[PDB]
Amino acid sequence: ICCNPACGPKYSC
């Protein structure tokens, strides 16, 4: 997961 906006398509929070 990724609790960040920079994650974009990786954002999982």
Q: Which secondary structure elements does this structure contain, and how are they paired or packed?
A:
Layout (H helix, E strand, L loop, with lengths): L13
GO molecular function: acetylcholine receptor inhibitor activity; ion channel regulator activity; toxin activity
GO cellular component, one term: extracellular region
Protein name: Alpha-conotoxin SI
Describe the structure.
The protein is mostly loops and 13 residues long. The chain is 0% helix and 0% strand.
* Main sheet specs: none
Q: Which word captures the global form?
A: globular
Oligomeric state of shown chains: monomer
- Report, as a whole number of angstroms, the end-to-end distance: 7 Å
Output the number of helix runs.
0
Instruction: Please state the CA-atom Rg, rounded to the nearest Å.
Output: 5 Å
Structural class: little secondary structure
Query: Could you tell me the number of beta strands?
Result: 0
Beta-strand level of the residues, as a percent range? under 5%
Helical content band: under 10%
Protein name: Alpha-conotoxin SI
Main location: secreted
Modified residues (Cysteine amide): 13
GO molecular function, one term: acetylcholine receptor inhibitor activity
A few lines on this structure:
With 13 residues, the protein is low in regular secondary structure.
Question: Which structural traits does this protein have?
Answer:
13 residues; 0% strand
